[PDB]
Design a protein around this ligand. Sequence first.
Ligand code: HEM
Ligand code: HEM
Ligand SMILES: [K+]
Ligand SMILES: [K+]
Lengths: 711, 711
Amino acid sequence: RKSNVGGGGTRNHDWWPAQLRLNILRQHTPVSNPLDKDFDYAAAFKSLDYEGLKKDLTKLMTDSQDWWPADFGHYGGLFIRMAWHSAGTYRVTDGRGGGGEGQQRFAPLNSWPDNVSLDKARRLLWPIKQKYGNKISWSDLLLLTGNVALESMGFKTFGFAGGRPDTWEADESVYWGAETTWLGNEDRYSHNRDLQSPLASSHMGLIYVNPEGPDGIPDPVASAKDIRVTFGRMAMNDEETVALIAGGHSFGKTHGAGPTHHVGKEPEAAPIEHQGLGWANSFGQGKGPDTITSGLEVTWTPTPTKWGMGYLEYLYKFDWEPTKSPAGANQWVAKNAEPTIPDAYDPNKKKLPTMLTTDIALRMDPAYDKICRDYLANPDKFADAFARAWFKLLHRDMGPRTRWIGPEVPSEILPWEDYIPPVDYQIIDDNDIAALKKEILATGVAPKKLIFVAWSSASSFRGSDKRGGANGARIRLAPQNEWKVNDPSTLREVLAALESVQQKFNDSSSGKKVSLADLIVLGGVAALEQASGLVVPFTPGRNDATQEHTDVHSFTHLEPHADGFRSYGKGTKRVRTEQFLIDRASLLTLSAPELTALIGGLRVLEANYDGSSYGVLTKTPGKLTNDYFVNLLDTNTAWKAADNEGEVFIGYDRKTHDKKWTATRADLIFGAHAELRALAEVYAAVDGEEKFKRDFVAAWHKVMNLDRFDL
Amino acid sequence: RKSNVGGGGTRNHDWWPAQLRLNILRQHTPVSNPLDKDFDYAAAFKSLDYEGLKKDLTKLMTDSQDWWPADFGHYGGLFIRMAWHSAGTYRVTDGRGGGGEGQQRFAPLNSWPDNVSLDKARRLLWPIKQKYGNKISWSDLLLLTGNVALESMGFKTFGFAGGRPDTWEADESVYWGAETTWLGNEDRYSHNRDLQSPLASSHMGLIYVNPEGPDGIPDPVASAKDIRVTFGRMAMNDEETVALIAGGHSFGKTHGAGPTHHVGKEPEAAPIEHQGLGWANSFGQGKGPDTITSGLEVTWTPTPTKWGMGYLEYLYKFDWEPTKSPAGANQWVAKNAEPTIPDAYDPNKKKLPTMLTTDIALRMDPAYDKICRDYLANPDKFADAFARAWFKLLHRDMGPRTRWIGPEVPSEILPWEDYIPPVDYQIIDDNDIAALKKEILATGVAPKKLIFVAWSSASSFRGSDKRGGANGARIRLAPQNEWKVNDPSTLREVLAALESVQQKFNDSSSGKKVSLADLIVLGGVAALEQASGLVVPFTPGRNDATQEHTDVHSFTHLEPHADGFRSYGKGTKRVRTEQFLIDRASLLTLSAPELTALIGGLRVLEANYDGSSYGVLTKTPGKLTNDYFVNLLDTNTAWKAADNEGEVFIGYDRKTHDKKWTATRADLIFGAHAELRALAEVYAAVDGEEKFKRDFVAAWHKVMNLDRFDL
Ligand code: HEM
Ligand code: HEM
Ligand SMILES: [K+]
Ligand SMILES: [K+]
């Protein structure tokens, strides 16, 4: 804070709100990481006493600690929430969020309004995290603990893959909304509403929807529409939405034993003496039977520490009546019923059953209604589907099966995976590679295309959920075959040339074969050698995918609205074209220097979709040089907008005024922004030529392999 | 800006203004840097065509560019102003700011109200920067252009020294005040006020002082107070101060041909088309004879492009009257004077002698007054005074000679460089080291003392300007011997033991000799093994300093307010205790993992001044274990404050409730902060025992070698 010390004062974000920042290209550096330089987590995890650990959590499940006591002597209810919440922030839209980086430890997710009391949950595990050392990450353990909680209450699980490495910095690249007030929502919206992309929540500080109902209004069919969209954003359908909410609230209790005004400050504003614990409660004890968490006082089942079919049965057993909690919140009561649900602390005492508007949405919603009914008709199809949705939930952002590790990895290939079969033939060596480059260039396809269709294939990767890339060559499959930015016409010509080159090399020839995936990328490397005069690295082993394993609705999210690398699209009201470009480079895990080299080169090589003259700042296109940067930074050139929208520009001579260049904001920001201009200059110098060229080939080859977890 | 995408939305600094951030320990990493991993700038600068570059810069002086024309056919004064403004941010208070990391080209120094048109001056140097590749960096290129400018105009410089590497990110560890409005000053201050440490300027966005006068009030003796303190904070005394103002303002002019409403938006909020050129001016031609920078229309001497005495002669030839510039700013005109100075563009027009309020402050002040006369009565002294104080200005934030590269490095030693004479003797070999480690422990000085003192030597470093550290053993010289944080009673006992040991060895030996500085650092390593059972590295070659070469006045600024490492001091109203610890950590160039490992180890070895047991969380102290972390993260403990101010705390048995430990905010931040808690956890695992020890020994040596530029 503006404290007269290092770290204090007004900063650039204060003076220049609108200005572009390259922060997100500087995250998760080794400098912030404690572990040994050569430490590898996957190798460490594989050596974990995994069984030993599972037994210790089940021991913990009943090991009620006195500073945060166990409702019904069981922490399972507490630990299924923690993990629902770890994973439940994932959103398909941009693929950010999820449990995969253990960010719940950190702000803001540690101090969210929906994350009350999970700091204590998280703390109850420290004695185990301390026992198992580096072989278990917080990322993993927080989800595994959720799985052990179910198993220990008589619910069978579908499986569990580990291998999520821990992070050490709060992840600054996630857009949670612009509100600036918790629980707020007056912007993420503009019934009949449209939650803006990429958001998958109705309020700031909340996981999916509101339990009290929209804006806190107990209208369950209005709350149903919230749940269909938000869970839709998180990749979930209606069947899976019903299995999750039922199976979830089949265990547990809520904590609103009092007026919330009695709760204190969240972990990040809490006093230092509380050691990462916030929400200090003054209502009576503050913990145990007096706990105050969300303000609603509900318990859904007769057996909160044991699996059964209580939640659905009870929902279709009474008529429900809206009431209010002991803290003043919109909840539902049962029009009639001897206390069947038991108290958390009095064994003797029992109470009438009750519910949550959201839960009540499942009955009042036309569709859910039914699903809710097929599950009662089949208390099995529902045991299965919950485990299946539960595994999907926790591993939706991990990526390809290649990244999954552990004794309990499942063998059933699931539909949402984007599965690629592992190569079951002999891979191409050096002589076959050399022989294929020649054959690809010999077809007579213009090198510019090969290069364009190489990048389009590779550029799909978004390293956040790890989906997309050259592997599997889905570029030939829907929806990518008809994406406007892929140039379907040229996409198909190149692909047709590669199809023949393949049948030629696989045909009757014995032993080895080559995927269209390896050829698509190798065509690029073939073309790029010819154009750079340098050796370009190439790793084979990609395989081809089938449409079956290509969820056309899943992949439609990856299509970009704007793409600076390919000179596609324009900005919006709230986002400038340069803002997308960094958002894309962050997604491709590219550094700022990496980004700079890539644009300078892709341009000179004309990788512009449709094929326009934008930023092709060379008089010898198709030949890799640093002409782009020399020309960009030229002080004898000037730039005028050629459109009032301010998306296209025109470079002209300052003295003679003759026109020279067209360009897009994707091009001029490298002159305009100070820090990016500092990288342009290195490549634009007279010594910069050959260095840029190597860097381009490094950065090119990096992009080409982003999805190679099989290595 | 909070726009629906990666990069946007509300952040943790919005939700929690007061919350501690560790950004300043994740800076200047190598992921942001475009140069090869094997590039060494000092090596590249050594091979630069330095003379050839110099010729090209003289050629640049009189090579007017029609898009930003040269006043009087010479860009010299513009360039001097450039160089004075880059260097001009430096403050002794902490060492931050200055020319040393080329930080003018980045926000916010690039968009400061005091740096208008320095974007054009910078930009004018890009063809040259482009021609010398990376062999000449920006940091150095800006400063060297100042020297050549002077040399081109008949002035003999003292010397020049390169070796400054370039930065690639905006430096965010600098506090330039708390104001949120450009030129604001209400906060800094709180005719007889006090400018808060560590600022060295009167207004936010200005280099030192207001040219118009204190709050735009043309009051010469009030302006002189402002100048004294601001230049004293930037290390210059009155004799130097007067030489700098009188040297600079002996060349060129100022610019304010029209009202300042005619200038548009600074670069970081300028339009993209302008390409990081800001301050677009609608007045007339908007450049050349219609230039507007400050808004003052003054031209100091009759020869703006040739060194000579004009500045002081004219100041002392006429008597002055206040008037206003075409922009409406307070300047001064002479009474009864004939048009002597010349116009920058018309060679047949002349105007009246003009001056500035700050410049009038030099004749009015009775201290500055005399010095000006002294310089008027002695012209070759004034030259001397200026070339020295000019050299000082450009090389104050650079460090010790060892750092200073190039053909124009002076052979004469200056009174403020903090010179340590080179080692002219044979350094100790491993046999001597072993032998000497034994003779140090044989004195019977407690290891605690050897570890306290050894660290107190190293701890004094600062990367801001690279001053302090264990070389020279200035912990024995004033002021560091009388520093309360250094516990002077024990510092004496240690130093007396090492002096007799040094004597011994010393003379006893033949050909070889050992320095007191090395025996201090070597005391700690010999003590740290005994405590750890490991090998602690040691790099000899340090030498000792004499009081002569220790600038005490400058050294006072290095005394801490709070030392989190040694358990000293309390916060401030504006600054918490931990915030100092992070400021000091950054200044020591430590990563957050290095920081965490260092507290743990220092506490357990009882390295607390005076000897307080605050944070010594071990039942077996003097021994290196990870007991600090195990006992700080233990879930069965809780803390409460036990001081009249909440600095100290008491750890107690959450169950039995009896007292265990005493602690301080320096220690309780590793349990409070989410990010720092994550690092302490690594070292608190059962398999982090021997890992911690290593990392402590790696980082303890890292800190003991921060100032060893002789490598
Ligand atoms: C829109 C959907 C949902 C909403 C709005 C929601 C909201 C809530 C709220 C407010 C609580 C009370 C927790 C407290 O304050 O102490 C609760 C409890 C719980 N929810 Fe959900 N929930 C949803 C779906 C689910 C799902 C899908 C699962 C699991 C897959 C789940 C698992 C739990 C568990 C285990 C508890 C018990 C908390 C405890 O005992 O500490 N919920 N839920
Ligand atoms: C309190 C101290 C000083 C203040 C407040 C100050 C302020 C100013 C101002 C307002 C201008 C006019 C710039 C414009 O409007 O374009 C100016 C010009 C100039 N100052 Fe200073 N100055 C100070 C000291 C110095 C020093 C120490 C140097 C060099 C050692 C220097 C070098 C220059 C030069 C070269 C120019 C002319 C720039 C040109 O011709 O374009 N000044 N100064
Ligand atoms: K992720
Ligand atoms: K510096």
